Structure 1
Amino acid sequence: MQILLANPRGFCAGVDRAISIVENALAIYGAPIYVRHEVVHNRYVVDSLRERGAIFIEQISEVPDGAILIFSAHGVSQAVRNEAKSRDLTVFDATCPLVTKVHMEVARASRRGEESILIGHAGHPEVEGTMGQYSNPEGGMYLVESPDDVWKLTVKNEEKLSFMTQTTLSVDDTSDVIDALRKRFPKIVGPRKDDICYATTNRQEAVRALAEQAEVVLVVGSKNSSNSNRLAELAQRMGKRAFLIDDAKDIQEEWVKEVKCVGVTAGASAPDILVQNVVARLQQLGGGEAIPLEGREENIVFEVPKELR
């Protein structure tokens, strides 16, 4: 059994920064450090940090007065940032710069009273944060997930309309939704293609190349990781069996019985030690040296805030 590794895979720049933000806070100020929402969507990263004294909560009301609070990499609404601000709290913001970029555009549209449409998945914290940058009661902020949602949307002024996207979507599904938006609203304005980040695009491109060669694909990532789910889906749609797994213990022997080529990749929040343990398990089940595919080079790093060096 040949083991192939996708490239790129694993940590993006935003996740690396967000994790360092919480590790350095804990180091500078000692435990506890409160974090609103899982800092990134990975069970192993979250447990590692909790076991070091980060405490993960869902609402600002759970955080005591005097505390240090970190916003997750997914970002937060204005109302959240305001509730934190009115409270007696030291705040560090781990929001990925690439999410912040979308926030600034939503905020600009709000100020203009011009309506905006986000493509994204209902209930995701990134969507709640980005929708929550819009407050102008005179325009509007609408969420669509699919062409069918576009076909039912009505807006107040279709001559003044722009769109934004969640950072971790399917590049291909999002393309379909934009084509629908432009047919329904010919004067809609947007970025040249979408707001899907470089890491999400590259890991999709990499898993496409991986699935071309492998009969089975394992995607290391947590159930609630939106970008990881898109990797598994992509492979499945190319007709490969694909499984989303947190660690090596999730691998079922049947999944790889009589398989000649298995591929492994990792979503943007999954640490490389988990992939190493997956490879070790595949090897026990008969695989050989893991071979990395050639891949698009990633070179972007986002530094922690100077106050957290």
Structure 2
Amino acid sequence: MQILLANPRGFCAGVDRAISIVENALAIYGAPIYVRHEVVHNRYVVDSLRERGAIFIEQISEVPDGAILIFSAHGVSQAVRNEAKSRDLTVFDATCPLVTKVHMEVARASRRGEESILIGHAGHPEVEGTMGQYSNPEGGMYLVESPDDVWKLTVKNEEKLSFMTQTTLSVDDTSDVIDALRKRFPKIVGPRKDDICYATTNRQEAVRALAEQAEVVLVVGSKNSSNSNRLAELAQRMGKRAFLIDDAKDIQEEWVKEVKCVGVTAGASAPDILVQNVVARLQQLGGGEAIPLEGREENIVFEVPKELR
């Protein structure tokens, strides 16, 4: 059995920065360090940080006065941010810069009382945070997940309408949503394409290349990782069996028995050691040396704030 590795895969700039923020805060201030939401959606990372004294909460009420609070990489709403500010908390923000970029646009449309539409998945923390940048009752902030949602949406003033997107969406499905938005609201304004980040686009392009070679694709990533689910989904739609797994223990022999080519990738929040362990397991199941596919070289890095270096 041949083992192929997708490239790029694994950690993106925003996840590496966010994890460093929490590690550095723990080393500087000691435990406990409060974190609003899993810093990144990865069980291995989260479980480990818990070990070192990080405490993950959903609501600011959960945090004691005098505490240190870090916002997760997914971002938070202005209401959350203000609630944190109204309290006597020391705050560090691990929101990824590429999410903050979207937030700034939503706040701008809110200040203008002009409606905005967000393409994204209801209930996800990044969508809650981005929708939570809009607070003007004169205008409006609407969420759409699909072309059908667009077909049913009505707005107050489609002459002054703009759109944004979640950073981890399917590139192909978002394209379909945007097409619908432009047919329904011909004066709608947005970025040149969407707000899907370089890491999402690159990992989806890389899994596409991987799936054209592999019969089975294993995506290292947790269940609640949006970007990771998009990678397994993409390979599945190409007709390959694809499994989203947290670690090597999740691999069932049947998935790879008599398979000549198995591919492995990882979501933006999965540490490389999990991939190494998955490769090791596939080897014990008959696989040979892991072969990295050629891919887009990534070079962006986001530094931690000076206050935490």
Same fold (TM over 0.5): yes
- The CA deviation string for residues 227-277 of structure 1, in whole angstroms up to 9 with x for no partner, is 000000000000000000000000000000000000000000000000000
- The CA deviation string for residues 167-200 of structure 1, in whole angstroms up to 9 with x for no partner, is 0000000000000000000000000000000000
CA distance in 1, matches of 2:148, 2:217: 30
* Residue of structure 1 in register with 2:27 after alignment: 27
- The CA deviation string for residues 145-173 of structure 1, in whole angstroms up to 9 with x for no partner, is 00000000000000000000000000000
CA distance in 2, matches of 1:135, 1:236: 39
Aligned to 2:116, the other structure's residue is in SS state: strand
* Residue of structure 2 in register with 1:123 after alignment: 123
CA distance in 1, matches of 2:280, 2:45: 20
CA-CA distance at 1:58 after TM superposition: 0.8
CA-CA distance at 1:109 after TM superposition: 0.4
* Residue of structure 2 in register with 1:42 after alignment: 42
CA-CA distance at 1:62 after TM superposition: 0.4
- The CA deviation string for residues 110-147 of structure 1, in whole angstroms up to 9 with x for no partner, is 01111000000000000000000001111000000000
Superposition misfits of 4+ residues, deviation over 2 angstroms: none
CA distance in 1, matches of 2:58, 2:192: 35
Aligned to 1:83, the other structure's residue is in SS state: helix
- The CA deviation string for residues 56-78 of structure 1, in whole angstroms up to 9 with x for no partner, is 01100000111000000000000
Aligned to 1:229, the other structure's residue is in SS state: helix
Aligned to 1:173, the other structure's residue is in SS state: helix
CA distance in 1, matches of 2:150, 2:246: 34
CA distance in 2, matches of 1:57, 1:94: 15
Aligned to 2:92, the other structure's residue is in SS state: strand
Aligned to 1:213, the other structure's residue is in SS state: coil
CA distance in 2, matches of 1:192, 1:34: 37
CA distance in 1, matches of 2:52, 2:248: 23
Aligned to 2:212, the other structure's residue is in SS state: helix
* Alignment TM-score, normalising by the size of structure 2: 1.00
CA distance in 1, matches of 2:106, 2:83: 20
Gaps of 5+ in 1: none
CA distance in 2, matches of 1:65, 1:103: 27
- The CA deviation string for residues 15-48 of structure 1, in whole angstroms up to 9 with x for no partner, is 0000000000000101100001000000000001
Alignment of 1:107-256 (within 5 A): 107-256=107-256
* Residue of structure 1 in register with 2:15 after alignment: 15
- The CA deviation string for residues 80-118 of structure 1, in whole angstroms up to 9 with x for no partner, is 000000001000000000000000000000011110000
Gaps of 5+ in 2: none
CA distance in 2, matches of 1:7, 1:205: 9
CA distance in 2, matches of 1:112, 1:87: 29
* Residue of structure 2 in register with 1:77 after alignment: 77
CA distance in 1, matches of 2:106, 2:302: 22
1:272 aligns with 2:256: no
Matched-pair identity in %: 100
CA distance in 2, matches of 1:87, 1:26: 21
* Residue of structure 2 in register with 1:2 after alignment: 2
CA distance in 2, matches of 1:113, 1:89: 31
CA distance in 1, matches of 2:88, 2:112: 32
1:292 aligns with 2:298: no
CA distance in 2, matches of 1:181, 1:56: 37
CA-CA distance at 1:79 after TM superposition: 0.2
